């Protein structure tokens, strides 16, 4: 940090969590060589949140309401552990591979009876680094039937996670609004929290990426 206004509002918030030995009376005045040992563990989980005024008296309060199964993370990176429906948690996982893979080299995860050429098995290419590739709806109608176990009937509540996730800011639109003859969509969030959800419903996405051979 460099601005003086940031340290003005941050040093005040650290006073209630630093003046503990002073009120109890275990530390007398003039002692700057013994107060850094007890405060060292109290600063390792707070110095990594710079330029963020969200860290206050409500971060550690969320841990008090989690007496049963403290596996949920609320406050510090709360987006990693969120609540997803059963048939909706696989939507963000399946749509992540449709925005970084070619529209032709997709038969390697379905029909393994084809003939692979071995192109190189180049590595520093723009693939998976330029951004989400524009994909229509024909790709989603052929990949969700392989990730799930049993069959799924595409009813009215199956396609509801396509438009409802637009308001939730999880997928972007190809500029202007399309018609109805199969619109195109992209991506938004990377794989920062996809691995956390996959380890709860028994799933592995690392072995499904095309860039990591």
């Amino acid at each position: 940090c460099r601005d003086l206004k940031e340290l003005r509002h941050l040093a005040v918030l650290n006073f209630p969590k630093y003046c503990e030995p002073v009120v109890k009376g275990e530390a007398s005045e003039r002692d700057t060589r013994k107060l850094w040992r007890n405060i060292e563990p109290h600063l390792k989980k707070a110095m990594q949140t710079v330029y963020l005024r969200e860290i206050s008296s409500s971060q550690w309060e969320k841990l008090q309401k989690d007496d049963t199964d403290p596996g949920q993370l609320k406050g510090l990176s709360a987006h990693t552990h969120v609540e997803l429906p059963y048939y909706s948690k696989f939507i963000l996982i399946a749509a992540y591979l449709a925005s970084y893979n070619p529209a032709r080299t997709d038969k390697r995860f379905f029909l393994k009876h084809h003939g692979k050429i071995k192109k190189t098995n180049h590595e520093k290419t723009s693939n998976h680094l330029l951004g989400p590739k524009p994909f229509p709806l024909d790709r989603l109608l052929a990949i969700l039937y392989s990730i799930v176990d049993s069959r799924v009937a595409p009813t009215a509540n199956i396609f509801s996670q396509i438009t409802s996730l637009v308001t939730l800011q999880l997928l972007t639109l190809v500029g202007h609004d399309d018609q109805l003859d199969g619109p195109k969509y992209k991506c938004t969030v990377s794989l920062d929290f996809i691995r956390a959800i996959a380890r709860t419903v028994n799933f592995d996405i690392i072995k499904y990426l095309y860039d990591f051979l």
């Binding site: 390697r108 995860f109 393994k112 392989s146 176990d149 072995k207 499904y208």
Partner: peptide, 26 residues
């Protein structure tokens, strides 16, 4: 166990979970 190592890792959940009664003897 030697035939499943010659295919894709994604289709392992359909062969191991279905034939779990045969891969657990003794």
């Amino acid at each position: 166990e030697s035939f499943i190592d010659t295919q894709k890792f994604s289709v392992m959940r359909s062969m191991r979970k279905t034939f779990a009664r045969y891969l657990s003897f003794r």
